[PDB]
């Protein structure tokens, strides 16, 4: 008959075999991740090979249906996803070359190691020692030397392979109808076919730039305060008007500023909010923590976990011969099986991470009724924001008092709120310019406007411009600094960490508004409220069946991302930082260089 | 003396309930029917009687009894009802609008699931038209969907009509096997010859 009926017939088969193949592959992956053995690796290889092969013939067969004869707009999305995500266009030699290059990237990042100068006796790896050194050690020479040494021993090797990589990726883009790989990445947010909700790929760059324009004053005030405080630690090295040295940010790349909290406490005399000793006194185990997390979800109206989740999931490190990765993850094996994999200790951080991970499980259970190809979030940002909005409420003093970990005798005034807001700020606000810088530089390099011989040249020039950080040691084109990043080496889109953050504060401000809350925004709880729960669930159950602009409209009432809630969240800190910056110069100078 | 007891410990205890698209039908006649023994099983996920009262089963007595048994997924049991619609209702087992009887449905996960996967339970996913009430279909022919007749071979727009369930112990409720038994009664111009025990 018509094309529509044939396409529906084909989809009604595809779904049925897809489900089973996905289950097999995901179960093999879980079996390896909880039981590290060679035969588990072989099982993963076999299952993944079967799944990846099946996707290939399905992508080939889907070509016979032209997309201009579909007007339902729901079949079209499934057909587009199936056609795109499994199609290969490069020649066999180029394909295997690209695969080998990617495998080399991963292998060299994992196996990379640096160690002490002029001593080949003993050496260490990045995760065990380097992270601890840059997080805790205060030695200027040690930090600067390690920061230089890892880059020298990694980026120099990775540079020519990246030069070969970018080419192949660009021809991959060119063979398709995209302009370049950058636009291929930007196509995730593309929306077409709906009047009043269309979103163009090029609009994202302008939106990102406009959003970053408004948030500059808060970042520069925080930068001035950080510079003033850091003057106490390293007086000689730091200039009152220059950019901060790149090796004094508390981590390897300066992605997060959390490690500087102790060095930059606003009021150290006053006690800090800590409940670890309270949980120790009350003899809390992992099951109690997860039951409390589940009760928090029940209190808002969302259904709680099934029996299979309790029986199958593991929450403690097996130890002994049984070795497994303790990176917290939320597995959705499909066909009604949800699990959480994490090793739990009796700490506040694990208590909050439990809620953060459980949010993902609830979101996964929300859209279980949708077809297989539409079982995902509206874009790459919603999923992360959903799991983060709830850790904000979990950490508020009111929730802790209601649960009982915090004594009722606790009081709130200036310093408690200021310290909490500053601790949140050094984690949230600091990372935005870094992410925007990295993504913009990668967009430019993929655009091809920048020649290879200036790759480093521009890289640092814009570092002193936006981020306001100057490198401590000059580098030539031999080094490839961005290659030292985990995400860059492993071919992962990085813009999702900028859209996620600005999303979450839009959600919270909405829910707190629905919960009839009054007072400061940062002290908000939604435990008893149920209207916010149903309003959230209405968007959660949608999945990918609707454009993300409409989904955003159904919760807040706007068709675009906004910055006002984020600033409104940190406004009391903004006023106090304005007060503290009366005698301190605002703005960094790009002319200064630490190495004379 | 109550001697001829209707056999109910056979339809409820056969250990092999066959596939849905080929459902076994049993005719019960010429015996004393006791309905108190069905309750001696595990708690039943679905126990629904439409035209009769559960307490008034033993006194009223009818001509013959028809028993149907099969296995379906957990969340499809809601489709076994008069007036319902869906794949299983209109392609494998259709019930009349004025159906009179009872429907039994209970979970059997511990007996119809293996870690490797059970592929011995089938169902129909494509049919040219709908099914009349109380009908079965066993024919297996390639369901042509495209204009070109592909002469009954597998390929584009030519799919096998019989799909296959999968069953493993690690599934979640709603994808686990469920055993369903339907009882049907009727009357006509004939001696009853089938009644429950009298005290
Ligand atoms: C079309 O095909 C593409 C690729 O072929 C598929 O894309 C994949 O989609 C999944 C689903 O999001 C991606 O998985 C995500 O990867 C992120 C990257 O993390 C890496 O690094 C960490 C260590 O930091 C590793 O542990 C991890 O395994 C990755 O190697 C993760 O961060 C994501 O996890 C997030 O969500 C979980 C909850 O689900 C949280 O608990 C986490 O904290 C975190 O917030 C997530 O796992 C995957 O990366 C994509 N592939 C690529 C190459 O990008 C599409 O799925 C496919 N579309 C289909 C089939 O419809
Ligand atoms: C685009 O295609 C989809 C899928 O073919 C269409 O969804 C279908 O919508 C109809 C009604 O809108 C659904 O019918 C309903 O079926 C249930 C039983 O599942 C029944 O109880 C209801 O009374 C109703 O008859 C149908 O199920 C649904 N398809 C699927 C696979 O769920 C959609 O309507 C199409 N778009 C447009 C604009 O028509
Ligand atoms: C949501 O409702 C529950 C049920 O009352 C609240 O739990 C009580 O909290 C008070 C503190 O205000 C305690 O004194 C009670 O002992 C708690 N009762 C139970 C049964 O836990 C909970 O505090 C409410 N949530 C919020 C944020 O107020
Ligand atoms: C892990 O793998 C080994 C090797 O096959 C197996 O004997 C064991 O049962 C598996 N599971 C656990 C929990 O060790
Ligand atoms: C939450 O779990 C309990 C069992 O601990 C259960 O009794 C209750 O019904 C669940 N909540 C909902 C809304 O079903
Ligand atoms: C602390 O809060 C009180 C509110 O009564 C206010 O009067 C005072 O100025 C605040 N102090 C600072 C340093 O902001
Ligand atoms: C009937 O079911 C019971 C339940 O335990 C079982 O022991 C018995 O063997 C069954 N009879 C058969 C299968 O003939």
Author numbering:
A (entry chain D): 19 to 614
B (entry chain A): 331 to 529
The authors write:
Local refinement was performed on the RBD–ACE2 complex to observe the interaction between RBD and ACE2 with better resolution, and the structure was reconstructed at a resolution of 3.38 Å. Although the S486P substitution occurs in the ACE2 binding motif of the XBB.1.5 S protein, the overall binding mode with ACE2 was not significantly changed compared with XBB. However, differences were observed in the RBD–ACE2 interface between XBB.1 and XBB.1.5: in XBB.1.5, RBD Q493 interacts with both K31 and H34 of ACE2, whereas in XBB.1, RBD Q493 interacts only with K31 or H34 of ACE2 through an alternative conformation. In XBB.1, RBD Y453 interacts with ACE2 H34, but in XBB.1.5, the distance between them is more than 4.0 Å. A common feature shared by ACE2 receptors bound to the XBB.1 or XBB.1.5 S protein is that the N103-linked glycan of ACE2 is positioned towards the active site inside the ACE2 structure. Finally, to understand the effects of the S486P substitution in the XBB.1.5 S protein, the RBD Y473–P491 loop regions in the closed-1, closed-2, and RBD–ACE2 structures were compared between XBB.1 and XBB.1.5. First, the Spike-hACE2 complex of XBB.1 and XBB.1.5 showed that binding affinity is enhanced by S486P mutation in XBB.1.5.
